[PDB]
Copies of this chain bind each other. A is one copy, B any other.
Amino acid sequence: KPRQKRTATKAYNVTQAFGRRGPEQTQGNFGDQELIRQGTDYKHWPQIAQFAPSASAFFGMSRIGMEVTPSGTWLTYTGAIKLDDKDPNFKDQVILLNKHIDAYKT
């Protein structure tokens, strides 16, 4: 039920769970219309979920902070994930990710 523990399915789209993809910082941007309505049932979700961090790597790699804004109390995070330049599917990994970064605008 917690928002960071939700999972997007076909019966529970990413828009239904994580709001409409928008330009604001409080909104998401990753995801084309394919994996938004399908969620984890996307035909290449394992090819995408292989970059989502674990529970330990989330706090080990990211830069965590604490904000108290007008909404409430937030646990901020920011980081980067290096892609394997020697992966045989790396040339295809950089394509599928760009297909969904800011895809709500196109």
Where the two chains meet, the residues of A that have a C-beta atom closer than 8 Å to any C-beta of B are 2-8, 14, 17-18, 25-31, 39-40, 48-67, 71-85, 90, 94, 97-98, 100-101
A29 to B66, CA, bound (A): 12
Q: Shortest beta-carbon distance, A92 to chain B, in Å?
A: 12
- By a CB distance below 8 angstroms, the chain B residues around A50 are 2, 5
B94 with A57: CB separation less than 8 A:
no
What are 18 A-B interface contacts by the 8 Å CB criterion?
A3-B82, A4-B52, A5-B50, A8-B57, A18-B56, A18-B60, A25-B78, A29-B64, A49-B55, A49-B59, A52-B55, A64-B100, A65-B101, A72-B84, A73-B94, A75-B83, A77-B77, A77-B79
